[PDB]
Amino acid sequence: TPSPVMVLENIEPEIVYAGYDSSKPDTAENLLSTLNRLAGKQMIQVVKWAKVLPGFKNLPLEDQITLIQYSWMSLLSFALSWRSYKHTNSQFLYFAPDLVFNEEKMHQSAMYELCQGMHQISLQFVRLQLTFEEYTIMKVLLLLSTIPKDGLKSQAAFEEMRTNYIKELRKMVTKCPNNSGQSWQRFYQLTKLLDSMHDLVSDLLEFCFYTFRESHALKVEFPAMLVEIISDQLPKVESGNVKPLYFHR
Ligand SMILES: Cc1nn(CC(F)(F)CO)c(-c2ccc(F)cc2)c1-c1ccc2c(c1)NC(=O)CO2
Secondary structure, eight states, rough: OOHHHHHHHHHHHHOOOOOOOSOOOOOOHHHHHHHHHHHHHHHHHHHHHHTTSTTTGGGGGHHHHHHHHHHHHHHHHHHHHHHHHHHTTTTSEETTEEEEEEEEHHHHHTTTTHHHHHHHHHHHHHHHHHOOHHHHHHHHHHHHHHHHHHOOOOOHHHHHHHHHHHHHHHHHHOOOGGTTTTHHHHHHHHHHHHHHHHHHHHHHHHHHHHHTTTTHTTTTTOOHHHHHHHHHHHHHHHHHHOOOOOOOO
């Protein structure tokens, strides 16, 4: 019988291409539209992953949908950091095999400072020597990191799943012989890193919401997957119905 961690490895989405077109100039509009398509492709993968994620099907369907919509940018950003760490040792932002950002591309995107904040997370992966198992568990914790302020359908089911994944991370870190003598300190660094995702993700979402609302005027394209997510989520955000959960705040 596979452990949850073994299942997480099996269900982890494969890396996809962005469809970067070298025949078009690296204008901000072209780069952002490409990123938005890549995010749409990856969000379809996230939905398929969530279907087979241990424990998730035990939450009401409406809560599963809510949680994906409340965490999508965090999930995608955390995966971006992992790819950047694994494939470039965090020298570059590895969006896809056909879309790798250096500083020039960060400027060309019109999102330099946001990209720099993402790069800082990937540098923390190097500092920590984050493992794949830590990454997969942490990604589930990000799915469970932001909730409506006016309630999920099942508080009980959500708390059970979140508690279970916190315990998975704690057990993995504190039982690993590589961490002996320092494992609780490592656990707290990992949970502080999770908390820091809220800061970055809020900033990413604010800019994405801006270009979404001004999409036609700015000539920034969005795929239907993102139109669905953002059209559902933005009224909830504007209403104030968002509670980021922190380990240390
Ligand atoms: C939609 C989206 N997804 N990801 C993650 C991804 F890996 F690139 C694709 O799945 C990002 C992203 C980009 C750069 C980062 F450093 C970190 C995260 C964005 C993103 C953030 C802000 C945006 C826009 C996109 N689009 C816009 O039009 C203006 O605002």
